[PDB]
Design a protein around this ligand. Structure first.
Ligand SMILES: [Cu+2]
Length: 23
């Protein structure tokens, strides 16, 4: 996501924590 821990570009692609991407 863009909010929980890192970055901006995606509601998925959660590379900082990898486990949740619930879109
Ligand atoms: Cu993310």
């Amino acid at each position: 996501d863009a909010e929980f821990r890192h970055d901006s570009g995606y509601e998925v692609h959660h590379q900082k924590l990898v486990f949740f991407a619930e879109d």
